[PDB]
Design a protein around this motif. Structure first.
Motif, PDB file in Angstrom:
ATOM      1  N   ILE B  49       0.844  -1.192   0.000  1.00 49.63           N
ATOM      2  CA  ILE B  49       0.000   0.000   0.000  1.00 49.63           C
ATOM      3  C   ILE B  49       0.878   1.240   0.000  1.00 49.63           C
ATOM      4  O   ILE B  49       0.597   2.221  -0.706  1.00 49.63           O
ATOM      5  N   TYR B 128     -16.085 -10.458   2.709  1.00 51.09           N
ATOM      6  CA  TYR B 128     -15.010  -9.777   1.999  1.00 51.09           C
ATOM      7  C   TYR B 128     -14.701 -10.490   0.679  1.00 51.09           C
ATOM      8  O   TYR B 128     -14.627  -9.856  -0.395  1.00 51.09           O
ATOM      9  N   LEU B 131     -16.951  -9.904  -2.174  1.00 48.46           N
ATOM     10  CA  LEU B 131     -16.854  -8.647  -2.907  1.00 48.46           C
ATOM     11  C   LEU B 131     -15.598  -8.546  -3.761  1.00 48.46           C
ATOM     12  O   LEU B 131     -15.635  -7.854  -4.790  1.00 48.46           O
ATOM     13  N   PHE B 146     -14.079  -3.695  -5.042  1.00 45.86           N
ATOM     14  CA  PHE B 146     -13.971  -2.333  -4.553  1.00 45.86           C
ATOM     15  C   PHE B 146     -12.517  -1.906  -4.382  1.00 45.86           C
ATOM     16  O   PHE B 146     -11.634  -2.729  -4.120  1.00 45.86           O
ATOM     17  N   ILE B 150     -10.219   5.113   1.749  1.00 46.98           N
ATOM     18  CA  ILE B 150     -11.204   5.358   2.801  1.00 46.98           C
ATOM     19  C   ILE B 150     -12.511   5.875   2.207  1.00 46.98           C
ATOM     20  O   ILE B 150     -13.599   5.385   2.537  1.00 46.98           O
ATOM     21  N   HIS B 153     -13.831   3.696  -1.577  1.00 54.63           N
ATOM     22  CA  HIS B 153     -14.635   2.477  -1.493  1.00 54.63           C
ATOM     23  C   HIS B 153     -16.089   2.801  -1.206  1.00 54.63           C
ATOM     24  O   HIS B 153     -16.977   2.082  -1.675  1.00 54.63           O
ATOM     25  N   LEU B 154     -16.364   3.932  -0.539  1.00 48.71           N
ATOM     26  CA  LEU B 154     -17.760   4.352  -0.417  1.00 48.71           C
ATOM     27  C   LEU B 154     -18.324   4.767  -1.766  1.00 48.71           C
ATOM     28  O   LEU B 154     -19.482   4.471  -2.097  1.00 48.71           O
TER      29      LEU B 154
ATOM     30  N   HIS C 197     -23.316   9.642   2.336  1.00 48.45           N
ATOM     31  CA  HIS C 197     -22.023   9.007   2.609  1.00 48.45           C
ATOM     32  C   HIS C 197     -21.027  10.007   3.164  1.00 48.45           C
ATOM     33  O   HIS C 197     -20.101   9.619   3.880  1.00 48.45           O
ATOM     34  N   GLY C 203     -21.385   8.399   8.671  1.00 45.69           N
ATOM     35  CA  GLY C 203     -20.248   7.470   8.689  1.00 45.69           C
ATOM     36  C   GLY C 203     -20.026   6.862  10.069  1.00 45.69           C
ATOM     37  O   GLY C 203     -19.746   5.660  10.194  1.00 45.69           O
ATOM     38  N   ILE C 206     -22.788   4.236  10.749  1.00 45.33           N
ATOM     39  CA  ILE C 206     -22.463   2.966  10.104  1.00 45.33           C
ATOM     40  C   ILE C 206     -21.371   2.212  10.868  1.00 45.33           C
ATOM     41  O   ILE C 206     -21.468   0.993  11.080  1.00 45.33           O
ATOM     42  N   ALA C 207     -20.304   2.907  11.264  1.00 42.39           N
ATOM     43  CA  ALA C 207     -19.260   2.276  12.049  1.00 42.39           C
ATOM     44  C   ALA C 207     -19.860   1.591  13.269  1.00 42.39           C
ATOM     45  O   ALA C 207     -19.505   0.445  13.597  1.00 42.39           O
ATOM     46  N   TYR C 210     -22.190  -1.527  11.907  1.00 35.84           N
ATOM     47  CA  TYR C 210     -21.269  -2.636  11.626  1.00 35.84           C
ATOM     48  C   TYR C 210     -20.630  -3.133  12.920  1.00 35.84           C
ATOM     49  O   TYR C 210     -20.544  -4.345  13.173  1.00 35.84           O
ATOM     50  N   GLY C 211     -20.168  -2.199  13.756  1.00 34.66           N
ATOM     51  CA  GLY C 211     -19.503  -2.569  15.004  1.00 34.66           C
ATOM     52  C   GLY C 211     -20.421  -3.297  15.965  1.00 34.66           C
ATOM     53  O   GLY C 211     -19.945  -4.096  16.800  1.00 34.66           O
ATOM     54  N   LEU C 214     -20.248  -6.830  14.596  1.00 35.57           N
ATOM     55  CA  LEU C 214     -18.930  -7.299  15.030  1.00 35.57           C
ATOM     56  C   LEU C 214     -18.934  -7.709  16.510  1.00 35.57           C
ATOM     57  O   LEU C 214     -18.493  -8.815  16.879  1.00 35.57           O
TER      58      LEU C 214
HETATM   59  C1  BCL Z   1     -19.198  -3.566   4.272  1.00 38.63           C
HETATM   60  C2  BCL Z   1     -19.760  -3.149   2.909  1.00 38.63           C
HETATM   61  C3  BCL Z   1     -18.797  -2.228   2.100  1.00 38.63           C
HETATM   62  C4  BCL Z   1     -18.371  -1.025   2.890  1.00 38.63           C
HETATM   63  C5  BCL Z   1     -19.179   0.077   3.138  1.00 38.63           C
HETATM   64  C6  BCL Z   1     -18.938   1.151   4.043  1.00 38.63           C
HETATM   65  C7  BCL Z   1     -19.706   2.346   4.244  1.00 38.63           C
HETATM   66  C8  BCL Z   1     -20.982   2.742   3.483  1.00 38.63           C
HETATM   67  C9  BCL Z   1     -19.036   3.032   5.258  1.00 38.63           C
HETATM   68  C10 BCL Z   1     -17.909   2.277   5.599  1.00 38.63           C
HETATM   69  C11 BCL Z   1     -17.059   2.806   6.613  1.00 38.63           C
HETATM   70  C12 BCL Z   1     -15.816   2.341   6.989  1.00 38.63           C
HETATM   71  N1  BCL Z   1     -15.325   1.158   6.428  1.00 38.63           N
HETATM   72 MG1  BCL Z   1     -16.024   0.125   4.673  1.00 38.63          MG
HETATM   73  N2  BCL Z   1     -17.097  -1.182   3.377  1.00 38.63           N
HETATM   74  C13 BCL Z   1     -16.609  -2.379   2.889  1.00 38.63           C
HETATM   75  C14 BCL Z   1     -15.341  -2.896   3.262  1.00 38.63           C
HETATM   76  C15 BCL Z   1     -14.447  -2.518   4.303  1.00 38.63           C
HETATM   77  C16 BCL Z   1     -13.267  -3.243   4.770  1.00 38.63           C
HETATM   78  C17 BCL Z   1     -12.923  -4.568   4.246  1.00 38.63           C
HETATM   79  C18 BCL Z   1     -11.510  -5.056   4.253  1.00 38.63           C
HETATM   80  O1  BCL Z   1     -13.784  -5.345   3.778  1.00 38.63           O
HETATM   81  C19 BCL Z   1     -12.660  -2.413   5.732  1.00 38.63           C
HETATM   82  C20 BCL Z   1     -11.403  -2.598   6.556  1.00 38.63           C
HETATM   83  C21 BCL Z   1     -13.480  -1.251   5.841  1.00 38.63           C
HETATM   84  C22 BCL Z   1     -13.279  -0.182   6.737  1.00 38.63           C
HETATM   85  C23 BCL Z   1     -14.051   0.946   6.971  1.00 38.63           C
HETATM   86  C24 BCL Z   1     -13.618   2.108   7.804  1.00 38.63           C
HETATM   87  C25 BCL Z   1     -12.662   3.044   7.025  1.00 38.63           C
HETATM   88  C26 BCL Z   1     -14.948   2.763   8.156  1.00 38.63           C
HETATM   89  C27 BCL Z   1     -15.507   2.259   9.527  1.00 38.63           C
HETATM   90  C28 BCL Z   1     -15.862   0.713   9.498  1.00 38.63           C
HETATM   91  C29 BCL Z   1     -16.197   0.211  10.869  1.00 38.63           C
HETATM   92  O2  BCL Z   1     -16.058   0.835  11.920  1.00 38.63           O
HETATM   93  O3  BCL Z   1     -16.674  -1.073  10.828  1.00 38.63           O
HETATM   94  C30 BCL Z   1     -17.009  -1.754  12.104  1.00 38.63           C
HETATM   95  C31 BCL Z   1     -15.646  -2.165  12.659  1.00 38.63           C
HETATM   96  C32 BCL Z   1     -15.101  -1.715  13.781  1.00 38.63           C
HETATM   97  C33 BCL Z   1     -15.746  -0.688  14.748  1.00 38.63           C
HETATM   98  C34 BCL Z   1     -13.724  -2.207  14.202  1.00 38.63           C
HETATM   99  C35 BCL Z   1     -12.599  -1.227  13.813  1.00 38.63           C
HETATM  100  C36 BCL Z   1     -12.471  -1.136  12.294  1.00 38.63           C
HETATM  101  C37 BCL Z   1     -11.412  -0.133  11.885  1.00 38.63           C
HETATM  102  C38 BCL Z   1     -12.029   1.317  11.937  1.00 38.63           C
HETATM  103  C39 BCL Z   1     -10.918  -0.496  10.469  1.00 38.63           C
HETATM  104  C40 BCL Z   1      -9.872   0.519   9.912  1.00 38.63           C
HETATM  105  C41 BCL Z   1      -9.396   0.138   8.481  1.00 38.63           C
HETATM  106  C42 BCL Z   1      -8.137   0.885   8.015  1.00 38.63           C
HETATM  107  C43 BCL Z   1      -8.312   2.397   8.029  1.00 38.63           C
HETATM  108  C44 BCL Z   1      -7.691   0.527   6.563  1.00 38.63           C
HETATM  109  C45 BCL Z   1      -6.817  -0.682   6.417  1.00 38.63           C
HETATM  110  C46 BCL Z   1      -5.798  -0.925   7.545  1.00 38.63           C
HETATM  111  C47 BCL Z   1      -4.315  -0.673   7.399  1.00 38.63           C
HETATM  112  C48 BCL Z   1      -3.914  -0.789   5.923  1.00 38.63           C
HETATM  113  C49 BCL Z   1      -3.547  -1.695   8.263  1.00 38.63           C
HETATM  114  N3  BCL Z   1     -14.587  -1.355   4.992  1.00 38.63           N
HETATM  115  C50 BCL Z   1     -17.424  -2.873   1.776  1.00 38.63           C
HETATM  116  C51 BCL Z   1     -16.834  -2.433   0.407  1.00 38.63           C
HETATM  117  N4  BCL Z   1     -17.811   1.111   4.873  1.00 38.63           N
HETATM  118  C52 BCL Z   1     -17.747   4.113   7.020  1.00 38.63           C
HETATM  119  C53 BCL Z   1     -16.928   5.333   6.848  1.00 38.63           C
HETATM  120  O4  BCL Z   1     -16.962   6.311   7.586  1.00 38.63           O
HETATM  121  O5  BCL Z   1     -16.109   5.309   5.794  1.00 38.63           O
HETATM  122  C54 BCL Z   1     -15.290   6.495   5.567  1.00 38.63           C
HETATM  123  C55 BCL Z   1     -19.010   4.200   6.081  1.00 38.63           C
HETATM  124  O6  BCL Z   1     -19.778   5.170   6.137  1.00 38.63           O
END
Ligand code: BCL
Ligand code: BCL
Ligand code: BCL
Ligand code: BCL
Ligand SMILES: CC[C@H]1c2cc3[nH]c4c(c3C)C(=O)[C@H](C(=O)OC)c4c3nc(cc4[nH]c(cc(n2)[C@@H]1C)c(C(C)=O)c4C)[C@@H](C)[C@@H]3CCC(=O)OC/C=C(\C)CCC[C@H](C)CCC[C@H](C)CCCC(C)C
Ligand SMILES: CC[C@H]1c2cc3[nH]c4c(c3C)C(=O)[C@H](C(=O)OC)c4c3nc(cc4[nH]c(cc(n2)[C@@H]1C)c(C(C)=O)c4C)[C@@H](C)[C@@H]3CCC(=O)OC/C=C(\C)CCC[C@H](C)CCC[C@H](C)CCCC(C)C
Ligand SMILES: COC1=C(OC)C(=O)C(C/C=C(\C)CC/C=C(\C)CC/C=C(\C)CC/C=C(\C)CC/C=C(\C)CC/C=C(\C)CC/C=C(/C)CC/C=C(\C)CC/C=C(/C)CCC=C(C)C)=C(C)C1=O
Ligand SMILES: COC(C)(C)C(=O)C/C=C(\C)CC/C=C(\C)CC/C=C(\C)CCCC/C(C)=C/CC[C@H](C)CC/C=C(\C)CCC=C(C)C
Ligand SMILES: CCCCCCCC/C=C/CCCCCCCC(=O)OC[C@@H](O)COP(=O)(O)O
Ligand SMILES: CCCCCCCC/C=C/CCCCCCCC(=O)OC[C@@H](O)COP(=O)(O)O
Ligand SMILES: CCCCCCCC/C=C\CCCCCCCC(=O)OC[C@H](O)CO
Ligand SMILES: CCCCCCCCCCCC[N+](C)(C)[O-]
Ligand SMILES: CCCCCCCCCCCC[N+](C)(C)[O-]
Ligand SMILES: CCCCCCCCCCCC[N+](C)(C)[O-]
Ligand SMILES: [Fe+3]
Lengths: 241, 281, 302
Positions: B49, B128, B131, B146, B150, B153-154, C197, C203, C206-207, C210-211, C214
């Protein structure tokens, strides 16, 4: 370019940081402060402080719990360090099943039964629970009990039931010497012609810790029983074929 | 450092691969062969990345975006800067996530507990993979997956949804949403219920599980019970994710139209399609 | 196959459990209901008793009146034809007054007046149910966590149907009573406000949604994984930590480097869920009152 929505979202993130701090400290009311592997207090406790004490007034005259509070295992622990440095396993010095260590561990819970809201014992053998009966599924009473060595360790003579949850919690199993032991329901498979227990071979059933009264089981006894049986998954694996 | 009660559990054994070679901890963290594997997959993925960000010209985590190959690449490999980094990062992510689940399994075995947690986690991994792998393969191109960014992907969620009109009309999506909402309802209720019994009113002894049952029976006429509520939380959350995967694996593979049309069935049934009046008449 | 405690193997049944009395006015508590063997494969088999009381009866009455006000409108939209009623059941919609009527209560009954009447009944039904969640806890000497968590859901519903329409100056802004129409309302809302969005409270919502899945998957699986040590008896595990609670904590400490307690995981749980509608209600309340276009707003704030 800093309106009410901006103020709101920055304020929310400050709130969230404070909430996570609160939640983490609340989840340090057991097990902390951290220890070195020799049991003395660890120098590094991390960035979150120990929560200030809270009290629970336990019902049924059972006293008062204060947490956090001074912690002790309240039991001997038959394990020895395998390395001078941190991070390596501690090896059982004796029989880990008999000594209750590793996945055989038990905790020194109160040596009294759990009680229901009315102060009566929560768990009772069906033979002492008026009107309780098997209402669906295979009734295990009378079935042979088989261990992971495919040999019969005994036969089921009663079901111990959680009265308030109307739930089978233990099978009472009579051994060849005529004594009985309790087997946790979550660790048995009831079949049409037997109860099968993966976790124990037939020769380990008598080692299941015994209960001191025939119609009740204390929390301490449950921990010893359940720890011993689950420990068999590791410690009877040489006999699992 | 250990929790005060932890030493007695830190025994050798339970590993699936490697014997005692990796059977140790780093601070609180268990290692194991799959801890090493997780470290390798995650470190490599993160490195790639970083590479992509260098190619892109930004360090801003809000702008870094790793895109899959253009649709024209089909299911082939693509050059690193043109989707190949996305492809290798996806392999590393999959390896890291599966290694995490198998590390949890080793932890379950050392502790003598059930395997429910890594089994539950596998549903997230499968969503995952729906998708980034199953749906792109069925659709014939990696470029349907996707992107890893950050906000981008939305935008992918929005662009994909609106390809089919209002995605609300996807019936499996409806079911999935109903499970997500019901799950959050159940979680709020379960947390509140336990806390309301452990932290009763001021001037009161701790309540008992019988008070929890009585509260919910008084309120709605039924108490699922303490075992039942944990079964139910697991079922609701896993079902939400199952129907999520389902609602996407069919979209673009066996359904191509505006999702609203799916409902046009019930409306256009011959014995009432022509009756005047109503909405559809 | 090793047993997994997802479905019960052997159900047992005894005398009905009448419950705790404490300060409950037993005059308003029904008799016990029948037992369900079907339900008993997954949870408790016993149905009832249920508590009635003034607040519950008021809530049930207003709630049915709400449901029936929508229903009669649907029957009128269907020309009283039962087949048109079943056919278009999901397409009917009781809509709020048009924007010209502002916040006025003088909209003709067929052009928004019935929506106001339905909403009045729904408002009385929810808030009296809220009082019921509080008083049922109080009568048993329990904490008020359920009422407080329910207020978070109420907050989003109040914002959608009441607070935001008032601040925007018309009932026309509120959500209609229909299955598909309220989905169309939701899609339209996001399009009108420049892509939800990009609403940071959406956002966050949604967190936490989803959380919540989780965390309940984690917690439900953890308790089942330690049910072989009596793990689901959480209150006594709080009072007297057992090997179930120790093994559950160490699974997570070894996995991700930190852990909960038997009590504290339920604080994580209640906040994870409550924050869904707390942030969600803030995000909707800001939309159109303060921020007209979330995408543009976000570009100028980051
Ligand atoms: C699930 C169906 C859709 C999708 C739709 C949406 C929509 C719509 C939204 C998000 C939002 C988010 N999504 Mg997304 N998202 C998907 C797939 C993913 C995947 C994945 C590997 O599959 C990841 C890691 C994320 C991660 C994220 C975060 C940036 C954010 C908060 C999620 C959260 O708290 O979840 C519950 C989990 C927890 C509370 C545990 C902690 C999770 C932490 C926050 C993950 C951080 C990821 C990191 C920044 C990136 C990679 C890590 C480093 C490279 C090591 N998404 C697919 C494509 N997602 C929201 C946002 O604000 O986006 C800007 C939002 O509105
Ligand atoms: C959050 C943003 C939007 C919104 C977006 C969505 C989307 C998107 C979806 C739903 C879905 C649903 N929504 Mg909606 N929804 C909103 C606000 C509401 C409100 C409200 C008081 O504000 C209500 C009552 C509903 C009700 C419902 C249900 C029809 C359904 C499943 C809800 C659920 O899981 O509940 C959890 C609660 C429980 C399990 C307890 C029981 C709930 C009962 C069954 C709700 C009955 C409602 C009504 C009386 C039903 C009449 C049915 C027949 C016509 C007689 N929505 C707001 C305006 N809603 C899903 C669906 O299937 O839509 C068709 C879906 O895909
Ligand atoms: C304009 C956009 C469209 C639309 C288009 C889509 C599209 C397109 C999709 C969805 C999908 C979903 N939508 Mg929809 N959706 C709309 C409106 C809504 C509304 C609403 C109130 O209006 C709701 C509630 C939902 C609800 C949902 C869910 C049912 C589902 C997302 C959850 C999921 O798949 O989890 C599954 C969980 C995961 C994928 C997470 C996997 C995490 C992995 C295994 C681990 C990550 C570890 C991480 C990297 C570690 C980081 C570091 C550490 C944190 C330290 N949609 C509108 C109408 N929706 C998605 C779906 O079903 O996907 C299957 C999807 O693709
Ligand atoms: C095209 C659609 C738009 C969009 C438009 C909206 C709008 C508009 C809203 C949301 C909202 C939400 N959206 Mg969005 N959303 C989109 C894309 C997504 C995606 C995605 C994968 O892209 C996801 C995962 C989500 C997810 C979510 C949720 C996190 C959030 C609703 C939380 C909740 O519990 O509400 C459900 C809970 C309630 C409505 C509370 C109900 C409480 C009352 C008291 C219940 C009364 C019951 C009644 C009396 C009946 C009783 C029956 C009895 C059972 C008998 N949206 C796109 C960009 N979304 C909401 C929000 O908070 O936004 C910030 C909202 O209003
Ligand atoms: C199936 C029901 C729900 C579920 C369950 C669940 N998740 C779980 C578990 C369970 C039971 C775990 O045991 C496990 C865990 O340990 O949790 C603490 C996990 C977990 N769920 C996580 C996240 C997560 N779960 C999610 C969802 C869900 N998890 C479902 C709703 C979501 C979303 C979007 O809804 C996210 C973000 C982690 C906290 C954790 C898994 C941790 C893990 O796999 O660690 C190993 C990997 C790393 C440390 C880093 C890998 C880095 C990659 C090589 C590079 C990045 C690739 C990625 C694709 C980029 C994404 C960019 C985004 C902007 C899109
Ligand atoms: C923290 C956020 C989550 C949350 C929390 C939450 N909700 C809650 C609570 C909590 C903590 C409660 O305490 C409360 C409750 O009691 O739960 C059991 C409630 C509750 N959340 C509910 C619904 C709900 N919550 C939702 C969402 C959420 N709730 C969030 C995800 C949703 C959606 C859209 O996602 C819905 C639909 C209810 C189950 C309940 C509130 C009950 C209420 O206010 O009732 C008033 C109405 C009536 C008493 C009667 C209505 C009548 C019916 C419409 C039907 C007619 C029936 C029949 C067909 C007959 C007709 C003929 C007759 C003569 C026979
Ligand atoms: C009743 O019971 C219960 C409990 O208890 C009593 C509980 O507790 C819990 C558990 C629940 C809680 C404690 C509540 C809070 C939980 C949530 C809100 C859920 C969301 C959780 C998170 C967001 C935390 C996620 C944390 C993770 C995934 C840990 C990993 C993170 C790091 C190590 C630091 C940041 C990561 C970076 C910088 C990138 C990743 C780095 C890598 C390269 C890979 C890392 C690999 C590992 C950690 C594994 C291998 C380990 C090591 C050290 C390898 C090194 C070895 C070598 C020699 C090479 C429940 C459910 C329960 O019901
Ligand atoms: C056989 O048919 C009969 C006739 C028996 C029936 O009964 C059939 C019944 C039906 C077909 C029922 C159909 C019902 C629905 C489809 C309902 C669906 C409802 C929704 C999807 C709700 C969506 C969201 C609704 C919201 C957010 C409402 C908010 C309400 C407000 C917060 C309340 C505001 C109060 C106001 C404006 C009144 C002011 C009053 C005060 C006291 C201040
Ligand atoms: C790193 C620290 C950053 C701090 C940033 C500034 C602080 C911002 C404020 C946020 C903190 C919000 C925390 C809310 C906690 C609410 C707890 C509560 O409600 O009462 C305490 C509780 O037990 C009693 O409840 P019960 O025991 O369950 O009855
Ligand atoms: C302006 C925008 C701000 C939001 C507007 C109001 C929204 C209403 C939401 C209410 C707060 C959310 C619920 C709080 C968290 C869940 C409850 C909790 O953990 O604390 C209660 C606890 O002490 C026990 O209560 P007691 O038994 O009375 O001590
Ligand atoms: C008159 C008979 C009418 C019966 C009508 C039934 C209505 C649905 C009720 C409950 C569903 C499950 C509720 C799930 C949320 C439960 C919160 C919880 O934690 O419950 C734990 C357990 O009940 C104790 O400890
Ligand atoms: C425990 C009783 C109530 C708890 C308080 C919960 C509300 C806190 C909300 C944070 C406020 C942030 N914001 C956006 C409104 O500014
Ligand atoms: C974003 C939600 C996840 C919250 C993360 C909370 C991290 C707390 C870590 C505590 C460390 C515990 N330790 C090792 C000091 O004992
Ligand atoms: C029980 C009825 C509750 C009344 C509260 C709602 C008022 C709405 C009035 C609708 C307007 C009808 N009208 C005659 C003025 O056209
Ligand atoms: Fe729990």
């Amino acid at each position: 370019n800093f309106d009410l929505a901006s103020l709101a979202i920055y304020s929310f993130w400050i709130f969230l940081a404070g909430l996570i701090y609160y939640l983490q400290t609340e989840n340090m009311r057991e097990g902390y402060p951290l220890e070195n592997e020799d049991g003395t207090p660890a120098a590094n406790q991390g960035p979150f402080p120990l929560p200030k004490p809270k009290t629970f007034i336990l019902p049924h005259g059972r006293g008062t719990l204060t947490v956090p509070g001074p912690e002790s295992e309240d039991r001997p622990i038959a394990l020895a360090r395998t390395a001078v440095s941190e991070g390596f396993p501690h090896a059982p010095t004796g029989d880990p099943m008999k000594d209750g260590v590793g996945p055989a561990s038990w905790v020194a819970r109160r040596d009294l039964p759990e009680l229901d809201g009315h102060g009566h014992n929560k768990i009772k053998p069906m033979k002492a629970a008026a009107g309780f009966h098997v209402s669906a599924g295979k009734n295990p009473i009378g079935l042979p009990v088989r261990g992971c060595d495919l040999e019969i360790a005994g036969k089921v003579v009663d079901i111990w039931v959680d009265i308030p949850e109307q739930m089978a919690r233990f099978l009472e199993v009579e051994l060849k010497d005529g004594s009985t032991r309790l087997l946790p329901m979550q660790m048995v498979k009831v079949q049409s012609n037997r109860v099968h227990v993966n976790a124990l071979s037939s020769d380990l059933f008598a080692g299941i810790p015994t209960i001191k009264s025939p119609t009740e089981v204390t929390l301490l006894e449950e921990d010893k029983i359940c720890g011993y049986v689950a420990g068999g998954l590791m410690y009877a694996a040489p006999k699992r074929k | 450092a250990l929790l005060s009660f932890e030493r007695k559990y830190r025994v050798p054994g339970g590993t699936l691969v490697g014997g005692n070679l990796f059977d140790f901890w780093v601070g609180p963290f268990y290692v194991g062969f799959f801890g090493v594997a997780t470290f390798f997959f995650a470190a490599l993925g993160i490195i790639l990345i970083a590479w992509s960000a260098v190619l892109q010209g930004t360090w801003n985590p809000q702008l870094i975006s790793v895109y899959p190959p253009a649709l024209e690449y089909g299911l082939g490999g693509a050059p690193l800067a043109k989707g190949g980094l996305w492809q290798i990062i996806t392999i590393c992510a999959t390896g890291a996530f599966v290694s995490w689940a198998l590390r949890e399994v080793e932890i379950c075995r050392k502790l003598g507990i059930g395997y429910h947690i890594p089994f539950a986690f596998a549903f997230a991994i499968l969503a995952y993979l729906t998708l980034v792998l199953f749906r792109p393969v069925m659709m014939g191109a990696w470029g349907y997956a996707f992107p890893y960014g950050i906000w981008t992907h939305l935008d992918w969620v929005s662009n994909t949804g609106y390809t089919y009109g209002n995605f609300h009309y996807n019936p499996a999506h409806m079911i999935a949403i109903t499970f997500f909402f019901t799950n959050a309802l159940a979680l709020a209720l379960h947390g509140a219920l336990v806390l309301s019994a452990a932290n009763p009113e001021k001037g009161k002894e701790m309540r008992t599980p019988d008070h929890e049952d009585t509260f919910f029976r008084d309120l709605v006429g039924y108490s699922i019970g303490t075992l039942g509520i944990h079964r139910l939380g697991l079922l609701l959350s896993l079902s939400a994710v199952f129907f999520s995967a389902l609602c996407m694996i069919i979209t673009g593979t066996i359904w191509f139209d505006q999702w609203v049309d799916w409902w046009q069935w019930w409306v256009k049934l011959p014995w009432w399609a022509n009756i005047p009046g109503g909405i559809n008449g | 196959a090793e047993y997994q405690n997802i479905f019960t193997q052997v159900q047992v049944r005894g005398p009905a459990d009448l419950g705790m009395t404490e300060d409950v006015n037993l005059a308003n508590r029904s008799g016990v209901g029948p037992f369900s063997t079907l339900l008993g494969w997954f949870g408790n088999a016993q149905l009832g008793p249920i508590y009635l009381g003034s607040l519950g009866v008021l809530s049930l009455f207003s709630g049915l009146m709400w449901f029936f006000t929508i229903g009669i409108w649907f029957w009128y939209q269907a020309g009283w034809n039962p087949a048109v009623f079943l056919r278009d059941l999901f397409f009917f919609s009781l809509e709020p007054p048009a924007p010209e009527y502002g916040l006025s209560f003088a909209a003709p009954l067929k052009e928004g007046g019935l929506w106001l009447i339905a909403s009045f009944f729904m408002f009385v039904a929810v808030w009296s149910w809220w009082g019921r969640t509080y008083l049922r806890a109080q009568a048993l000497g329990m904490g008020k966590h359920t009422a407080w968590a329910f207020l978070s859901a109420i907050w989003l519903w109040m914002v959608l149907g009441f607070i935001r329409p008032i601040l925007m100056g018309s009932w026309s802004e509120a959500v209609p009573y229909g299955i598909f129409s309220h989905l169309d309302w939701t899609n339209n809302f996001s399009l009108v406000h420049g892509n939800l969005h990009y609403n940071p409270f959406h956002g966050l919502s949604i967190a936490f949604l989803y959380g919540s899945a989780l965390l309940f998957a984690m917690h439900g699986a953890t308790i089942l994984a330690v049910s072989r040590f009596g793990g689901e008896r959480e209150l006594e595990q709080i009072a007297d930590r057992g090997t179930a609670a120790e093994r559950a904590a160490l699974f997570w400490r070894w996995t991700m480097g930190f852990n909960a307690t038997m009590e504290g995981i339920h604080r994580w749980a209640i906040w994870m869920a409550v924050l869904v509608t707390l942030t969600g209600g803030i995000g909707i309340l800001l939309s159109g009152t303060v921020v007209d276009n979330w995408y543009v707003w976000g570009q100028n704030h980051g």
